[PDB]
Amino acid sequence: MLKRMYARVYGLVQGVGFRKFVQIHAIRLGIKGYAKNLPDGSVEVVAEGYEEALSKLLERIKQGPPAAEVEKVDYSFSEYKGEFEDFETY
Ligand SMILES: [Cl-]
Ligand SMILES: [Cl-]
Ligand SMILES: [Cl-]
Numbered sequence: 001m002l003k004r005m006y007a008r009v010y011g012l013v014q015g016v017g018f019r020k021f022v023q024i025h026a027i028r029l030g031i032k033g034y035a036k037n038l039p040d041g042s043v044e045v046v047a048e049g050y051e052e053a054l055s056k057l058l059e060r061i062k063q064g065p066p067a068a069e070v071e072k073v074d075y076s077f078s079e080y081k082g083e084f085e086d087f088e089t090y
């Protein structure tokens, strides 16, 4: 039940506290990895932990904070690799 999740988030998702929103919910859920601003205005999330935790995080990612407007989320799941010690933003 440990897994890795990839998500990329499109819309009004930069400059609206989106990464900090992902982070707080990741910390609440025990999830490690990062939320990364991409050069096309989208956001990438790379997250590791228990699959049900990741699923809860994905629910939050699809909404974002009040200031965001999430248009689309592409996501996938793969084998847990155990690569992270905490949840960061950059
Ligand atoms: Cl942010
Ligand atoms: Cl982990
Ligand atoms: Cl992978």
Ligand code: NA
Pocket (backbone or CB within 6 Å): 008, 074
């Ligand atoms: Na994508």
